[PDB]
Amino acid sequence: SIVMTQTPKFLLVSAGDRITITCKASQSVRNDVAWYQQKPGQSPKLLIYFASNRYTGVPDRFTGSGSGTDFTFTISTVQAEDLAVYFCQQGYTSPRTFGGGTKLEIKRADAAPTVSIFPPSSEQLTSGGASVVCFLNNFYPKDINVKWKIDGSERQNGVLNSWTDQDSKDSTYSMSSTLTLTKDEYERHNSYTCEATHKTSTSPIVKSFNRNEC
Amino acid sequence: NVNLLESGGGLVQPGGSLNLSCAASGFDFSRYWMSWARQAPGKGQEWIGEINPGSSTIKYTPSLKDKFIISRDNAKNTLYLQMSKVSSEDTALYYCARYGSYVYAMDYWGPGTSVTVSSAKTTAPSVYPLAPVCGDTTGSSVTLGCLVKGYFPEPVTLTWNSGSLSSGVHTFPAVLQSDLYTLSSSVTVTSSTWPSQSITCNVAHPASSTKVDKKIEPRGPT
Ligand SMILES: *[C@@H]1O[C@H](CO[C@@H]2O[C@@H](C)[C@@H](O)[C@@H](O)[C@@H]2O)[C@@H](O[C@@H]2O[C@H](CO)[C@@H](O[C@@H]3O[C@H](CO[C@H]4O[C@H](CO)[C@@H](O)[C@H](O)[C@@H]4O[C@@H]4O[C@H](CO)[C@@H](O)[C@H](O)[C@H]4NC(C)=O)[C@@H](O)[C@H](O[C@H]4O[C@H](CO)[C@@H](O)[C@H](O)[C@@H]4O[C@@H]4O[C@H](CO)[C@@H](O[C@@H]5O[C@H](CO)[C@H](O)[C@H](O)[C@H]5O)[C@H](O)[C@H]4NC(C)=O)[C@@H]3O)[C@H](O)[C@H]2NC(C)=O)[C@H](O)[C@H]1NC(C)=O
Ligand SMILES: [Cl-]
């Protein structure tokens, strides 16, 4: 089977810049190469076919070129809406194998996270569990660290984190952190804190509550 | 107006069998080559196989040529994928795709149907409303949330006010721990809005026929 080796695997570009992705085929595939774009939460769309032809309705900023084993795909001026995974495919012989993809991320101005903390819901406490939730929303760049403290002591066991894909509309990231205890352990302590460390501030962002006090 | 819609996905035990369907409309199905592809969690797209209009040519990726069978019904405008002897590496979103006229390029892809290969048990979610305490606000807006815990398999669908509220929403990817998923979502509205305008998280988990509405109610000053 023909191998399509796609590079780079990741791209971080500012809006307005030019990007070029490369696909190298393990043997010649004539001009039988297609390029696809897959935005977050959507199915792939065909952009380029027969190596260098734009598919119907594809805007001018997308082009492809190449023949034989060497192929490139270019966005002349990247737009924020172009955030997506891009991948090549050869259609010369079966199996019609895909490249491994390139994830295109957009550079934007720094943004500090908006942090909110939530004690366990009484509905969950009735069932014997206790999850504390911290949302860290609309920040940039993506690298961020969250620390949980219980009565001042760092807690790592029981923490589950999830991250959104970069937003195509504001180019930010968001994150959710959930600390799950038993109701019994939760009631053994009074102060719960989520601390966010991010390049925008020298100081951590600290959100806290006390079970008994406001 | 071209449309493809896959169905039939869901949980299947390892070694079991599952048939996927792909309903087509808006073009002359009998004149087009059709194909299947899949995207496993964290991986790129993988081409599965193709079938020509008359079903006289059917091709597969070698690793799948003995597990999967592709077929089509031109009279019913439907493409099929017969999965058998499935294993954990067959867990993926499965896509059906049309080939463009006289090209081996996939010019229209369906939304996909999710397949999970696992022996973990189907479990219904618990849905928990999240409201701030002590009057916690970020400036002129408040953030509420919804926590969905303890379910299997994916997917859960979460909306706010039955989808009427979509601005200011972050719904986070489900995370698996010890064969159960956690999912959460936050919604940020202006302080004036809530609680005078009610906000409700709606959670659907077809695998357990769970459909839950949880209104967010204050537990602190507003
Ligand atoms: C996914 O889709 C596929 C495809 O479906 C189509 O496409 C989809 C997308 C839809 O549109 C759908 O609507 C379409 O139809 C589904 O595949 C179908 O699955 C059904 C089963 O659910 C199969 O139906 C069975 O067919 C058997 C005969 O099949 C052979 O012939 C077919 C026609 O040519 C051929 O298509 C088959 O591939 C198969 O061909 C043979 O294959 C073997 C090995 O692969 C080769 O060695 C042969 O050479 C080859 N021959 C040929 C000519 O090619 C029927 O026998 C079977 O009937 C039995 O089972 C049903 C229950 O399912 C019972 O109700 C019946 O009464 C009957 O029961 C049997 O009764 C006898 C007694 O008379 C018992 O014998 C006794 O047994 C004892 C031991 O237990 C002793 O041995 C005793 O001495 C002995 O007498 C049997 O035990 C008993 N068996 C059972 C199980 O109870 C049935 O009709 C379709 O063939 C199949 N079609 C295709 C194309 O694959 C698939 O199901 C679906 N999956 C899912 C998950 O949705
Ligand atoms: Cl592939």
Written in H, E and C, the secondary structure of B104-152 is CCEEEECCCEEEEECCCCCECCEEEEECCCCCCCECCEEEEEEEEEEEE
Nearest CA in chain A to B107: A46
User: Chain B, 57-116: which have a CB under 8 Å from a chain A CB?
Assistant: 59-62, 95, 100, 103-112
CATH of domain A1-108: 2.60.40.10
Q: Which domains does chain B have, with CATH numbers?
A: 1-120 (2.60.40.10), 121-222 (2.60.40.10)
Nearest CA in chain B to A125: B128
Ligand index nearest the alpha carbon of residue B38: 2
Domain A109-211, architecture per CATH: Sandwich (2.60)
Buried b (16+ CB within 10 A) or exposed e, A160-184: bebbbebbbeebbbbbbbbbbbeee
Q: By the 8 A CB rule, do A87 and A72 touch? A: no
* Two tokens, residue A153: 């002591």
| CB nearest to B177's CB, from A120, A131, A160 | A160
Question: Which of the residues B93, B103, B178 would you substitute to probe the A interface, choosing the one with the greatest number of A C-beta atoms within 10 Å?
Answer: B103
- Over its C-alpha atoms, chain A yields an Rg (Å, rounded) of 23
CA A56 – CA A71 distance, rounded (Å): 20
Ramachandran sector of residue A183 (left: φ over 0; alpha: ψ -120 to 50; beta: rest): alpha
Residue with tokens 């001018």: A60
CA B69 – CA B84 distance, rounded (Å): 9
Coil/strand/helix, residue B92:
strand
Q: Return the number of other C-beta atoms located less than 10 Å from residue B135's C-beta.
A: 11
Burial (0-12, 13-18, 19+ Cβ within 10 Å), B193: middle
Instruction: Report the DSSP beta bridge partners of residue A63.
Output: A74
Q: By the 8 A CB rule, do B133 and B222 touch? A: no
CA B192 – CA A102 distance, rounded (Å): 43
Burial (0-12, 13-18, 19+ Cβ within 10 Å), A109: exposed
> How does strand B10-12 pair with strand B18-25?
unpaired
Q: Quick check: A31 contacting B, CB < 8 Å?
A: no
CA B41 – CA B177 distance, rounded (Å): 15
Coil/strand/helix, residue B89:
helix
CA B141 – CA B166 distance, rounded (Å): 16
CA A120 – CA B170 distance, rounded (Å): 19
* CATH 2.60.40.10 placement within chain A: 1-108, 109-211
* Two tokens, residue A24: 């190298």
CA A205 – CA B93 distance, rounded (Å): 38
| CB nearest to B129's CB, from A87, A121, A135 | A121
| Helices and strands (H and E) in chain B: how many | 0, 19
> How does strand B113-117 pair with strand B10-12?
parallel
> How does strand A4-7 pair with strand A19-25?
antiparallel
| CB nearest to B170's CB, from A45, A133, A164 | A164
CA of B80, closest atom in ligand 1: 9
Closest CA to A90 of A20, A8, A6: A6
CA of A162 relative to ligand 2 center, distance in Å: 28
Strand segments, DSSP code E, in A42-128 are 45-49, 53-54, 62-67, 70-75, 84-90, 102-107, 114-118
Helix (H) or strand (E) holding A184: helix A183-187
Nearest CA to CA, how far is B37 from chain A (Å)? 10
CA of B47 relative to ligand 2 center, distance in Å: 4
Closest CA to B143 of B157, B156, B129: B129
Instruction: Report the DSSP beta bridge partners of residue A184.
Output: none
CA A161 – CA B171 distance, rounded (Å): 13
